Amino acid sequence: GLFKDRRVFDENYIPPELRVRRGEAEALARIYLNRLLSGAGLSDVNMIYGSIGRVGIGKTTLAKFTVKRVSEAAAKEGLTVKQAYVNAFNAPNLYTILSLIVRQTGYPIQVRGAPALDILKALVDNLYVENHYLLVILDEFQSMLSSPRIAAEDLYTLLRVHEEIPSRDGVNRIGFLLVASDVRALSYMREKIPQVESQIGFKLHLPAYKSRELYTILEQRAELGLRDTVWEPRHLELISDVYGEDKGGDGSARRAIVALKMACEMAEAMGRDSLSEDLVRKAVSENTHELEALSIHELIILRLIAEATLGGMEWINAGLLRQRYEDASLTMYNVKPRGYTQYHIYLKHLTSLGLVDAKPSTTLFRLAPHLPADRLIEVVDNIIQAKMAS
Ligand SMILES: Nc1ncnc2c1ncn2[C@@H]1O[C@H](COP(=O)(O)OP(=O)(O)O)[C@@H](O)[C@H]1O
């Protein structure tokens, strides 16, 4: 045993307090509560997303922890807010979303063989009967927007419940916290459900963790879940210094905690009394996303788009980007520039990706608004160099 409590390291564990997102949780929780306390109970739809390609940055955690503190602060006011969490990777339709929600309520709502609409009505009625409020988390919400097994009208009936399913006493008792992978979710939403999107109370973008933030996160897991003589700060700094986004990493707290976990269980198999720097570096060592799968040609092409975007141009034409890609491809990346239809297939792939936007009337292209060019280019150049040398 290096562990004093192994649960602290499970993927699902939230700590009893936040030390990095900690302010921006008690606060939000303050938002959610003020609407409750001012009357007009629970109805807002809020949203959390990150940058594109970023994972393990505290989205889920911030949401779960925010809902929990809303519950607690509400309880002190004698109110009663219930929590539901639903992951879209587990919920292919409206039926299955509602069924997960009601099972977490504990209410006696008939769910077997029942219409979705009927479940939602029973839920609205139980919340009135109980005088309870429900705050629902919809995680991986982007993959609900694209799912063809969920229609616009389903998202509407859920997310504007109160417009379609009035309360016995007029009090709205369901709010939602959407968690999406990135800002592309908002376009989709304006496409599919603009009547909800134009009405979102708070949209919060979360940045990837810096090294000092990863330190603070690891330290707290160490304090809570490892024996006190087992780690020193130096051991934690070896992970945070590599994964901190200010030092060229991901900013992933999941990669950071997993690494620390792994090193602890390597020490244990050795019967060792503590961590050693070696074990941590070993873990860090055996431990960009939808950019990481692209072809050098797509990377090379997308890079040049960001440079136009970086130096004046809003919208490049096809012919121009074409010769530029040709010029750079053979002369600068020693790869042989592909043919015309193949180039335009790359260009279709990056637009289907929301990494590039098109403008029809060959087609006009600019870097997707949400990507910073100078720093994407910096990223696109590490991934571009992992492919040059193979
Ligand atoms: N602010 C934080 N404080 C403590 N732990 C965190 C924090 N943010 C993230 N974590 C941890 O890092 C891992 C990844 O977090 P998660 O919320 O799943 O990121 P995302 O949803 O953006 O992929 C989880 O173990 C989570 O507990």
Curated annotation (Swiss-Prot):
Signal peptide limits: none
Residues bound to ATP: 56-61, 209, 221
Short name of one Pfam family: Cdc6-ORC-like_ATPase_lid
Entry keyword annotation includes Nucleotide-binding: yes
Biological processes per GO annotation: DNA replication
InterPro entries: AAA_22, Cdc6_C, Cdc6_ORC1-like_ATPase_lid, ORC1/CDC6, Orc1/Cdc6_arc, P-loop_NTPase, WH-like_DNA-bd_sf, WH_DNA-bd_sf
Gene3D superfamilies with a match to the protein in the record: 1.10.8.60, P-loop containing nucleotide triphosphate hydrolases, Winged helix-like DNA-binding domain superfamily/Winged helix DNA-binding domain
Transmembrane feature ranges: none
GO molecular function: ATP binding; ATP hydrolysis activity; DNA binding
Keyword Ligase belongs to the record: no
Function: Involved in regulation of DNA replication. Binds DNA.
Name of the protein described by the UniProt record: ORC1-type DNA replication protein 2
Source organism (scientific name): Aeropyrum pernix (strain ATCC 700893 / DSM 11879 / JCM 9820 / NBRC 100138 / K1)
Gene this protein is translated from: orc2
